Amino acid sequence: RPTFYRQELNKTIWEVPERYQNLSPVGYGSVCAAFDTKTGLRVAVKKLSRPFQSIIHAKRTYRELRLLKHMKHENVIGLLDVFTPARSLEEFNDVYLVTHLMGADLNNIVKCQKLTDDHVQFLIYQILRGLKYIHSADIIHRDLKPSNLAVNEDSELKILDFGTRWYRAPEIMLNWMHYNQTVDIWSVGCIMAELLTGRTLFPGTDHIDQLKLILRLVGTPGAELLKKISSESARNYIQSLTQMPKMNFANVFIGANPLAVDLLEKMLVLDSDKRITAAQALAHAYFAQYHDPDDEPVADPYDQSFESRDLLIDEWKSLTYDEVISFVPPP
Numbered sequence: 001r002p003t004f005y006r007q008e009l010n011k012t013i014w015e016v017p018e019r020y021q022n023l024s025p026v027g028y029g030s031v032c033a034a035f036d037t038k039t040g041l042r043v044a045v046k047k048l049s050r051p052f053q054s055i056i057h058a059k060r061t062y063r064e065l066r067l068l069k070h071m072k073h074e075n076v077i078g079l080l081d082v083f084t085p086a087r088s089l090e091e092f093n094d095v096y097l098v099t100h101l102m103g104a105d106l107n108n109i110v111k112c113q114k115l116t117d118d119h120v121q122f123l124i125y126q127i128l129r130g131l132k133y134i135h136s137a138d139i140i141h142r143d144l145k146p147s148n149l150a151v152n153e154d155s156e157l158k159i160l161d162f163g164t165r166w167y168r169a170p171e172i173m174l175n176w177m178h179y180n181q182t183v184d185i186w187s188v189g190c191i192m193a194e195l196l197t198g199r200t201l202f203p204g205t206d207h208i209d210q211l212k213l214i215l216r217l218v219g220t221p222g223a224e225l226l227k228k229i230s231s232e233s234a235r236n237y238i239q240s241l242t243q244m245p246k247m248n249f250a251n252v253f254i255g256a257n258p259l260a261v262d263l264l265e266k267m268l269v270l271d272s273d274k275r276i277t278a279a280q281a282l283a284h285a286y287f288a289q290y291h292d293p294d295d296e297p298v299a300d301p302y303d304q305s306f307e308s309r310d311l312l313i314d315e316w317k318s319l320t321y322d323e324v325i326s327f328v329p330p331p
């Protein structure tokens, strides 16, 4: 066991091993920037807030730990270290998580000017490469957006917080019951279109304005999609809205790579059953410069049977404590 030291940052008291130095605040948790003297890397340290205050808090603490311990992918935020100042389970009251400090997120990267097509190719390829890994473990991000994409100054990308309304899929906006993993593919399309054009694709003012902007581009549901909506009140709610066909994306993204327009067409389909997948998008000719079918790995099967269990606080805390003691750091 290493020696810990204490210091308060922005009213938050931190208890970390001496190995992590130069704590600097970055932003249900609190994140700090730090220098790992053991490896020489700049790391991000997250202190979980009130991790065992309630059953819901304890299950969320166990969920984030099991999640990060399983993700071992260069484009997915993984676990560099987990520690706690406690020496037993009865003392176990705080949890700290350490990962890479990329330096920034994709947020507001385009507010002044758009990115080149080659720059977008490299950024979107990394998101999809990590999404194929995340989806292979049967995990849906559900809420992908520029702030969930950790990026460094060389545009190397890692997906963050896996498992604003401008990047949310239409089926989630309409509160439909069934979702597949392509709800994240819709988010990537909204992100990709924003990087190419310099402007948000669907900057809706409220909830109905968000849906109305979406249906103006992708069109109202055709006959094949209407036949799959079970609720009759939901069916007439789209016939409540005005009818208009799907736009030709070539007439929307003027001056863009025709391969980029073709990829957005496959990503922004209203019917999520016909939406392109992460593995299929990696094989698109738009990523010919970066696609390597032998360097796009999938994840080990991920056990999520704990999500349907109702346990006590002391049981979730003991399960979380077992995952801390069994953590083996990466190479």
Ligand SMILES: O=c1[nH]c2cc(Nc3ccc(F)cc3F)cnc2n1Cc1ccccc1
Pocket (backbone or CB within 6 Å): 026, 031, 032, 044, 045, 046, 068, 077, 078, 079, 097, 098, 099, 100, 101, 102, 103, 104, 105, 150, 151, 160
């Ligand atoms: O680069 C990173 N790393 C980040 C880690 C975490 N939280 C976190 C998750 C899991 C952990 F295990 C530990 C954590 F700290 C959050 N945003 C991160 N950004 C993006 C960013 C954005 C602006 C300024 C600096 C950094």
